[PDB]
Q: What sequence folds into this?
């Protein structure tokens, strides 16, 4: 009956509303993915409940157990019916879950504290004074783990061994680490999240360089789900009608503070 | 056994080699989609035959007959097994054929002769002096026909009844018309093709403004084809290993003339 949606607290995709405690269920949350879920549900004709992924992760497979965690795991093991989140379409994930055509484009990018002497990934790789890392259990880390491209592989070799550790549990922890590190920490994260934060007080970070790759976020469903077909057509509809662009302006730039 | 691949002569995706007359089969052609087809086939483990679409079109459904033309038609009517071309993923097409996840991102863009006093679609819609049109039987025309957005519907209203016709049969025809028309014709075409032309002699055109929308090219197969799954995984694999970015540089910028 009611579709269980798994999602993740990530600004400006899903955020606890300012006055949520006096609100109940889905009304406690706002954001790009909250509006998207409402649109998708409207067009596919289902009722839904938003749930925050229990382990707070996007999804990766444990090398030893082979068990998936995060939102991907919640789909794989039957704990949720659909994931509506900034979840990156990847080869490894497509092997175990289904994705709609992308609803948003992104690439890996570099976040620095304003004034930091870094302009590119190549820059980061040719030095050591400034440490840099990525999010745990996500596609950015996996991208670096598996890249045969010379510059990226060298970055991965430094990251996988550094001490203290350069990886963070949440995007917020990575951003805070940049802001409090006096320019000695740079954070590798998706351009969407980088560009959003850049327009938020205290206005002390910025995106530098071009994107390191090009990929997309998709709405994910359990493999063979009956929901997959309708959801895909809905994403295409919403893109063609300009809604996806409308939502993007609503949450990134109509909400800039800088 | 041998996979029949439908494609289209559109630079720099698929072009006739200089000595093509002395060459046979797939060796007659070169370009981004030629390189891509060789890779998709290698990774999916199939032999293939490139064939240029007979009517030279991408694909639209005739309002009267209801028959699909172009590469889309070749797939729908069983004349080809797969399309490897700059074929835009759209809702109407997804209803009749299957698409892989996108292999390239693009948006509708504006091409002007250098010096043309136009900076945006809004600029174009608000005037009469400079004519503008699009390709026939393609996703750009359909975009404008179907659009509810104010600026774009105004453009469609003008274009559909402009005389002489502002629509062209091939991208090359639209580009020639821009070049020959002394700034009095602007051409709406995808950013990928606009960007390519900008780097070709006589270096007299350019892309102006931002993209009007955001979408992707996919590799297409007949609905329910068993090739679809493998092709999709190959596209993701090839993106993650950086092949797609490498091919774009090779055919757009390494060969740039301006
Ligand atoms: N979008 C990523 C999470 C953020 C990141 O890895 O940078 C994923 O789906 O895993
Ligand atoms: N890529 C387009 C053709 C070019 C255009 O319409 O501008 C299509 O698949 O129809
Ligand atoms: Zn709607
Ligand atoms: Zn010839
Ligand atoms: Zn290969």
A:
């Amino acid at each position: 009956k009611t579709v269980v949606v798994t999602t993740i607290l990530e600004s400006p995709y899903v955020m606890m509303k300012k006055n949520h405690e006096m609100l109940e269920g889905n009304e406690r949350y706002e954001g790009y993915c909250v509006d998207l879920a409402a649109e998708i549900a409207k067009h596919c004709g289902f009722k839904y409940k938003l749930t925050i992924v229990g382990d707070g992760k996007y999804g990766a497979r444990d090398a030893d157990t082979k068990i998936w965690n995060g939102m991907v795991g919640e789909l794989v093991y039957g704990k949720a019916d659909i994931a509506i989140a900034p979840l990156t379409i990847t080869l490894c994930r497509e092997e175990v879950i289904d994705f709609s055509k992308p609803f948003m484009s992104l690439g890996i990018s570099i976040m620095i504290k304003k004034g930091t002497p870094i302009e590119s990934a190549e820059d980061l790789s040719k030095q050591t004074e400034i440490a840099y890392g990525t999010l745990d259990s996500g596609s950015t880390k996996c991208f670096f783990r598996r890249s045969k491209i010379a510059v990226f592989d060298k970055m991965w070799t430094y990251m996988r061994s550094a001490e203290p550790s350069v990886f963070v549990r949440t995007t917020a922890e990575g951003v805070a680490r940049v802001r409090k590190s006096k320019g000695k920490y740079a954070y590798l994260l998706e351009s969407t999240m980088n560009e959003y934060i850049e327009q938020r007080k205290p206005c002390d970070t910025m995106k530098v360089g071009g994107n390191l790759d090009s990929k997309g976020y998709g709405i994910a469903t359990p493999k063979g789900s009956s929901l997959g077909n309708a959801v895909n057509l809905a994403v295409l509809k919403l893109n063609e009608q300009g809604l996806l662009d409308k939502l993007k302006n609503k949450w990134w730039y109509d909400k800039g503070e800088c």
Q: What stands out?
A: Chain B has ten helices and 13 strands.
